[PDB]
C-alpha cells in the first residue's frame, strides 16, 4: 500500500533548528513531486513547500522562505524539510503530500500521518491531578458523574483513562486550554450510583512527555 | 496571493440527506486551457486530510459517487447526495492555479439530531488542590444538543465572570451530542471567604436554566 510516514517533530526552542523526514513506500517516489503542508493547532491547512520530481523546481511559502529548505533523497525514498530560526508560528502538525503532474493525473492524492512540531521555550511540566467527586449534600440520582481535573502541564499530551479502560462508553474528554501558560483539561465518567462508591473508580493520567503517570482513586464525600 | 473563502460551519444535517459546501476564490481559477484548478479535501476527526475532488469536478480514487464537485471560475460547490456518518469532518478547498497554494479556512460538517438538555454536575475544589493555594470549581454540562449553550457562575448568589474557562467537546461520535466543562478558578482564600457556589446552564431546550449548587457549609 501507499505509505507516507513523517518524523522529526517534537519540542524545539524558538530560534532552533529541526529536520523533518517523510519516508515513502508503496509507489514510485521519484516520479512524484512532493509538498509539505502544515496545520497549526485548531487551525486550517497551510501550504509550506514544494519540490518537483527530479528536484528541478522548488517553491516556498512566504512565511518560511529563507528559513526552510526542502530536499529529497530519491534512492532512499525520503523527503526532507530542514527548518532553521524556528518561530512560535511554525508550531503545527506537518504533513508530507505526494503529487504527480501529468495529463489526467490526480495531484495531492495522498497525505502522510503527520508529525507534530512545537516551538516553545515553555518547560516540560507534569500535571497536577485533582479528583472531582460529588459534594457532601449532593442528591443521589440513578447515575453519578465523577471527574479528574488535570492542571498545569506542558506540552499538551495527556491521556486520561478510567479503571484502566474498563469504563469508556460514558467518558468525556474535554479539550485542553491554556491557563497561566500551562495546559488544563478534565475528564468525566458517568456510572450507576449503585456501583460507586460501592466499587472503586480510578482515573489514570498519563503524561509521557514528563514520563509521569498519576492514578487518582475517587473517594466519596 | 489568491484568497479562498469558505463558511466556518455548515448547517448540521441528518445522515441520508444532501449537503452542499461552498468555496470562493478572489481570482478565477478557470485557466485558459479549460481546467479549473480547484481541489477539495476532507479531514475526518483525528485523521489526515484526504483528497476528494481534483480540478473542480474529477472524483478521486476510492471516493464514493455520493460526492460530486462543480463550480464556475470563482465559485465552487462540493455536494454530498446522501450523508454518511463517516463524512463528518472539515472540508477544505484549495486552489492550484498559482503558487503559493492557498486553502479555505475549512467548513466543519457535523450531524443533526434531536434537541437534548444538558446533564449538569457541580464539583467543589478537592482538598488536594486547596493544599496548593488554588481552588477550581468544576461544572460538567454533558450530552446536550445543539452545541450552543451558556453557563453563569454565582458565588453567594452574586454573578462571577472573571476566572471562568469553558471547554467544549467536538460532536460525540456515538450519540451526536455535545458536552462542555466550565471551570471557575479562585485562590484558596477567596474560595473560603464564601459559602454558596452555583453554575446555571441556559440551553434552548428550556426557558429556565438548569441550576446546580453546593454550600461549603
Author numbering:
A (entry chain B): 20 to 240
B (entry chain A): 21 to 237
Which of the paper's sentences describe this entry?
Rhodopsin has been shown to interact with the Gβγ subunit of the G protein heterotrimer to assist binding and activation of the Gα subunit. Nanobodies, Fab fragments, and mini-G proteins have been very important tools to overcome the inherent instability and flexibility of these complexes and obtain near atomic-resolution structures.
The construct of the human Gαi1 subunit was expressed in E. coli, while the Gβ1γ1 subunit was isolated from bovine retinae and thus contains native post-translational modification important for transducin function. Thus, our bovine rhodopsin complex contains the unique combination of a full-length C-tail, Gβγ purified from bovine rod outer segments, and Fab16 that may have contributed to trap the transient interaction of the intrinsically disordered C-tail to Gβ.
